Symmetry: C3
Subunit: 198 residues, 3 copies
C-alpha cells in the first residue's frame, strides 16, 4: 500500500523528542533542544501542540533547553508508589521510594542527595549518641570529663585533606574523584532534538 | 521513489520509546508509558514483539510505567568495563566503575549512593582511627582518659540543625537544599511514549 | 499527498537515537548502541554524518556503547546558567548549579556526588570545630585534656556496622540499601538504538 502525507505525523508526531549523536542537523524538520525559538507560521503544529510552554511567544514558540539536563518521566508511577518501597522499614527508616517523584511535563529539578549518616570516629560508653550509635566494641572514647551542653562539631565535606603524595590507604577517605561539585550517575552527553514540522 | 507501507515500521518500529513534550497525544499510533494496556487485536506487532513483559495479558499487553523514572542502558558496556575504571587504585579504593551496571531490559533499580567517608570533627594523636585518619595537624582531641571499648557515635543525616535565621557560614553544613529525600541529578521531567501500531 | 523517499530521512534522520523496549530488532534500519560497527557502504549516511566519532574506521564506523549509561544533554543551558542557581548563597555555600554541566557530544562522565557535611556525634564548647559546628545545646563532649595538635578521625563509609538481627532504630544508620557501589537515581534499564540507514 502506498503511503500518504497524513501518516508522517502519525509515525513521528510534532512535539516528540529523541537524542542525536552529532553536532548539526540535516533538515529543518527537527531542532535542537538548546532553548531557541521556531516560527509559528513555519511550524504550525508545534505552535498549536506546544505553544509557549517552553517560553517564546505565540508567534515564535520556545524550544526546550535541555543542555546539561538528564530526563525523567513526569509524575509518579507504579514502581515508585508500590507500598513495598514506601512507608518505614523495621528500623523506622523510610523506604527508598519515599519522597521520589517526577514533576509536571517540562518541570526542572535540581541535583539532590538523600539524607544519610555515617558512624563516627569517636564515641562513649553510654547509649546516648545524639544521632544514634553502634553497639559497644573496639571503638575509642574518653572516660573523663563528659558533659552534655557542648556543640556538635561538623565533619568535613568529603574532599581529601592530605596531599596524594603523603597518603596511603588509611589516610584516604574516598574512591578517586567520587566527591565533586555534582551528584550524577555514569552518563553519556548527547544532543536532544525535537520534531517541529513535517 | 514512492514510499510504501512496509517502510513505516522500518522507520520507527513498534516497541520503540521516545520522549514527548506535552500532556496529550494526537494519534493512537503511540501511547504514554504510564502503565496502561493495549489491545492485542488493535496492536498485533506490539503484542508479538513485547508480549506481557511489562504486564497485562496476551489479549491486552501491558505498557511500561516510566512515570518518575530515569533511563539507563541495559547491560554493562565498554565505558564501564574498561580495566582503567575497575579494580583498586593506589590507595586500595575501588575505581568508579566498580559495581556499576544497567539491568536487564525493563528492570527497575532504586536510588543509591556510593559509600564514602568524611573527616571527623574530633580525633586523637595515635594513628588508630577505626575508619582511618588524617596526618597530625591543627585538629582537636583530648589527652585524658582514652579507652577502646566504647561505641561509635553516629553523625547526623546531613540536614541542618540550627534554624536559618540563627546560622552563618560556619554553622551551616551544606549547599542549599542539596540534602533531601532523593538522590538524583539535575533533570527535566517529560512524558515517555511507546510506538504501539502503525 | 503521496510520500516520496526523501521524506524518510527528514522524518527520522540517520544518526538519531531512541529507546527500545525489547531484546532484538526487527530490521536493519536501526542498530543497538552496544559498541558494534556498521559497514560504510551499507550505511553511507551514517558514515558521512557520524564517521569515526564513536570508534571503528571510515570503512566500518563505530556505534555508541551506551550499555549501563544514563544520558544527559551536552553543554550547559539556561536552567544551569541562571544566576539564581550559581554563585554563593547567604551562608557562603555554592548554589546547586555550580560545577554542573553536560560534556561534548559523546563524552562520558563517571558517577559523582556533591561534597557535603554531617554534624558529628561529639564536640566541645568553643566555636572552633575544624569544619564548622552547631550552636551549643544537648550535645556530648569533654571538659578535660583538650589540645589542638591531633589527627581528625574519619567517619565510616555509610554501611551498617552491626548485624540487622542486633539493630534497632538508633543502631541503624541509613534507609535500607541506600548505600552501595553506585550513585544513581531510580531508573528503568532499556536498550538504546541508533538509526543507521533508510
Ligand atoms: Zn555523607
Amino acid at each position: 500500500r502506498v503511503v500518504t502525507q497524513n501518516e508522517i505525523d502519525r509515525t513521528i508526531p510534532v512535539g516528540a523528542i529523541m537524542m542525536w549523536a552529532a553536532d548539526s542537523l540535516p533538515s529543518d524538520a527537527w531542532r535542537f533542544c538548546h532553548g531557541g525559538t521556531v516560527s509559528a507560521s513555519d511550524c504550525p503544529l508545534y505552535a498549536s501542540r506546544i505553544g509557549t510552554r517552553y517560553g517564546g511567544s505565540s508567534s515564535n514558540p520556545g524550544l526546550p533547553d535541555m543542555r546539561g539536563l538528564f530526563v525523567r518521566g513526569s509524575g509518579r508511577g507504579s514502581h515508585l508508589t508500590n507500598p513495598n518501597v514506601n512507608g518505614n522499614d523495621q528500623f523506622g527508616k523510610p523506604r527508598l521510594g519515599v519522597g521520589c517523584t517526577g514533576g509536571y511535563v517540562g518541570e526542572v529539578q535540581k541535583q539532590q542527595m538523600s539524607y544519610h549518616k555515617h558512624a563516627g570516629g569517636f564515641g562513649e560508653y553510654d547509649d546516648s549518641g545524639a544521632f544514634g550509635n553502634t553497639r559497644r566494641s573496639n571503638f575509642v572514647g574518653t572516660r573523663k570529663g563528659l558533659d552534655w551542653d557542648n556543640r556538635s562539631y561538623f565533619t568535613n565535606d568529603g574532599y581529601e585533606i592530605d596531599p596524594a603524595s603523603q597518603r596511603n590507604s588509611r589516610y584516604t577517605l574516598n574512591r578517586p574523584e567520587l566527591i565533586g561539585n555534582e551528584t550524577r550517575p555514569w552518563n553519556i552527553s548527547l544532543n536532544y532534538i525535537i520534531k517541529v514540522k513535517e
